[PDB]
Design a protein around this ligand. Structure first.
Ligand SMILES: NCC(=O)Nc1nccs1
Ligand SMILES: [Zn+2]
Ligand SMILES: [Zn+2]
Length: 58
């Protein structure tokens, strides 16, 4: 048995603009820079944790 995974943005539900589609190293969900509010205007240079994961960790 097999599993295919394709990441879609939590917000717009599209999987394009993959360079801007930030993948949470915490929970593996995706969200484009420009679909966040406030918009993310820095592409993370290393790893990304999403707002939901940061709020749970704190
Ligand atoms: N988990 C890190 C991450 O998603 N980095 C990315 N940089 C550019 C696009 S995605
Ligand atoms: Zn999006
Ligand atoms: Zn997360």
């Amino acid at each position: 048995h097999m599993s295919i995974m394709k990441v879609y943005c939590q917000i717009c539900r599209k999987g394009d603009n993959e360079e801007l589609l930030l993948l949470c190293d915490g929970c593996d969900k995706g969200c484009h820079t420009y679909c966040h509010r406030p918009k993310i205007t820095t592409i993370p240079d290393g790893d990304w944790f999403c707002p939901a994961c940061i709020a749970k960790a704190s």
